[model samples]
Target: AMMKAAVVRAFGAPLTIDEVPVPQPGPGQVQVKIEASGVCHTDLHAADGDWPVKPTLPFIPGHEGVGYVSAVGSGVSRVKEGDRVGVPWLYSACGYCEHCLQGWETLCEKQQNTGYSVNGGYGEYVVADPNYVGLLPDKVGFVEIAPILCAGVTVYKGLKVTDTRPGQWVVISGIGGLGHVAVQYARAMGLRVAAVDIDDAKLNLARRLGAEVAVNARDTDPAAWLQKEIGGAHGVLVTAVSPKAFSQAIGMVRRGGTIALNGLPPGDFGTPIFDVVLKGITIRGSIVGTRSDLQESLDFAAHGDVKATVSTAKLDDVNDVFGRLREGKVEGRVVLDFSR
Candidate 1:
């Protein structure tokens, strides 16, 4: 049987739609009929040849996807056919590794990422290891759960790393896909939130998402505004992916505070090590999270406490969506409608 997919023939070129044979699941894997796939910033990095980990040529590129299981390989008992699932960036890992044993599967030595290292959900059917697939809450729609696979989970894991309790200040920088979700998750976790972004619309949306304060990074000094409004946050979550933003986060967090770096900065981004050390601050770099993190993100959204603000497009519009994403013109998450 044939399935339609968006294939990248070369680097710095548009993703062309083509008909390819559907792949059968290997042992411990499952075939998923993709309902929706989120267009992430990392995909743009792949297309532009900016990512350090290059995707193979002519590959299907999409990591955040939501669909249903159509087939399961032998020994896969976690899920069955027809079960709803979400495919995250972390597609598989070595289960017996020390990181995996400690529930830090994201750090597994044998971790394989979807789209970047393997075929992903830009196609109609995506094959995923059952151990890495997140069980989606039935109450959430596929499109609604798509971004949670990456953006939502990354921020959720960042929040967990912060270890901030209820009523404490949590600053979310760059209220775009990642930061917007971070704002909502902070609120859901009962923490007070401060949103930082240049766009007025995004700032407004962050407020709607229950952020207690919104600072326009373009117009005002984020650190100064945050300090004045919230007395310096207990934790600063940096999703801006810019060296300047990451450097400024250190000043925004309180003494002995934590900074969760969720965005992947281009090139070799550098920060002042002396400043971090002097402040007694903890800085952690977070990658796309584990299956459990994605599941919890879905659960929070399913309960109506958090949701992805998304824009939808037909699968054929992949190139245009990537263009908008690169130009920072997109407002929220953009998902490709495979059913179209």
Candidate 2:
């Protein structure tokens, strides 16, 4: 009973494929035969030792995974064998905790995160608590739904936090993987979108994805340009994982507007609190969504309103794929195919 997995041996090292013992589901858990797993920036952070929480050496790294249930533990009634599911960052939360009761399990004090805190779907077989697994829409394939487990759900929840209405302007900063998907979600919600990015190619992609305005932060001053063009966006979703990006987002949002920080800013980055307080603006942080939010993201995609731009690779190419992601060379979501 062996399973193949990509293991990170040390910090700043590439993942190596290894054959390990297959893991069985515990009570209230289900074992899934992974089909596709998305290579997220968070995975890069984990490898580069950027996360606040340190992982065990030689750990499996993957969270945005889609698969089918192959076995269920005792008391697992939520999903059955052969059921399709997606594993997200919030693998499980203490059900009786205050945050869990308030539908804010993403911030639970004892939350278990896939890839970060536990063995994740980089392996052929992975176990997920039934309560945390997101039921995937039958209409979408594993590769398509994989990125939604994290990137899509984060942006969707950010939109919810912004509380903007239709026809209002929402600025999505960084037109990379998260920002690209955020643009489509903003348009699907009937909000006018303005995208900010350093790359001209990504800016063009944003425009094609329904952004009303695309600002190249490299060529133009993003804060001033956003103020002049859209008169300051009603809400600014900061998906660029940069300290400078966070500061610029605060300046680009209009008075009384909100700034939803969805990106993982590198360790110990400082945000401007005085400016936020003076402008009466709201600044919030969003982790990957709850189980319900994952379902809602799938529904939005099933309606043909959202689609992930993805690049695929075989599991054997994990190191090369990670290198591309680490160098910021990947254009869209990168999915690893375990079936190969």
Candidate 3:
């Protein structure tokens, strides 16, 4: 059988939509008939070879893939045919590592990323490791749950790493795909949110989504405004790749606060050493969530407490979607609708 897929035949080029043979599940793997796939910034970077570690040529790129398990490989018992699941960034990890043993599978050195290391869900069918696929709840639709596979789980884990309790404030920087979701997750977790964005529209969106404070860093100083108005955030999550955003987070977070960084901008991230030491600030680089974190993140969506601002497009328009993503024209998350 043939299936449609967007293939990156070369880097710094458009993804071509091609008809390819349907992939079958190998032992310990499963075949997912993809219904929806979220376009992530990491996919754009992978396609452009922007990172030091690049994806192989002639590969599919998508990690936030959601659909039904059409076929299960031999010996797979965790999930079966007809079950709904999501293929997230952490495709697989060595279970024996200390990180994996301590439920930090995303930190495992032998971990394989879905789109970057393997052919991912830019296709109609994707083969995934049975143990790594997120078992989604029936309450969340495929499109709504698609972005949660990566963007949602990522920010959710970052918020947890911030170590802020309920009623404490968290500043979410960028207010794009990941930042917007961070605001929702923070609110759902009962944490107060102060959203930061250069774009006013995004700041408005953040306010609508329950952000108690919205700062437009384009004109107003977010750190100063946050400090004067709310006495600064108890924790800060920097999802923007802009260096200013990362630096500004230090001033926005109160003493003894944590700053969890989530963006992977192509440059060195530097911070003032004195402020970090004197303020007793904790800085942590958060990656995508583990299997258990994915399940818990999805549960937030199942309860209708969190939902991504999603826009849909056809898989055939994957190239155009990537262009929009490159130019930062997309407002929220964009999902490739395979059904369309």
Candidate 4:
């Protein structure tokens, strides 16, 4: 059997749509007939080989894929055929690893990431670990839930790491795919949100999505505004893929406050050591969520506490979407509709 997929044949090249063999489920895995796959910045990086750890060539890139289970491999009991599920970034981790044993599977050394380490949901069919894939709530559609598999769970976990209590100020920088969603999660979690963005449209998006204060980094000094208005952010979540944005986050966080780094900006970015020490800031990189976190993130959306702003495109429009993402023109999340 064959299926259509967006294939990355070379680095720095546009993905080509081609017919590929339909993948079958291995033991403990399940095959999903992908309905919608969310485009992520990581996918663009993966295709362009921008990261130090590059994906192998001739691969399909997409981690936030949501669809129905078409088949289940032997010994798969967590998910059965005809069930809805999402193929997330953390495909599977070595259960025996110390990190996995400690319930931090995202930190497991032997983890295989979907889309990057393996063929992902850019294709019509994807084989996923049944235990790792989260069962989709009936209330959430494939298109709406796709980005949550990645963006939602990611920022949710990042927010958790910040440990900011309800009513505390949480500044979400970037206001793009992940930042916008993070604002909603911060509000749903009862945190007061301050949005930072370079674009006015996105800054407005932040305000519309419940961010109490929207600051355009271009027009005004976000750090100054945040410091003056609220005495600095209780927690700052940096989701913009810009080194400057990362640097700015350090200045906005309050003394003794925590800053969660969720964006993977290439190369080195630094903050003044003296400032970091003086502020007593705790900076940590927060990766995508664990299976449990994914579940909780989805439940929030399922209950309508969080809603993703998304646009749909056909599989053939993958390149156009990637172009938009590269130029920072995408307003929200874009999902590839496989049903077309």
A best-first ranking of the candidates according to their TM-score comes to 3, 4, 1, 2
Q: Rate the local accuracy (lDDT) of all candidates.
A: 0.86, 0.87, 0.91, 0.91
Residue 153, candidate 2: C-alpha displacement in angstroms: 0.4
- Higher-scoring candidate on lDDT, 2 or 4: 4
What's the lDDT for residue 308 in model 1? 88
In the range 294-331, model 3's lDDT, one tens digit per residue, is 99999999999899989999998888898898898998
Residue 229 lDDT, candidate 3, scale 0-100: 94
Q: How do all models score by TM-score? A: 0.95, 0.95, 0.97, 0.97
Give per-residue lDDT, candidate 1, residue 239.
Answer: 86
lDDT of 4 by residue, 264-296 (tens): 765777679998999999998997899999999
Taking all chains together, the TM-score of candidate 3 against the true structure is 0.97
In candidate 3, position 151 carries an lDDT of: 90
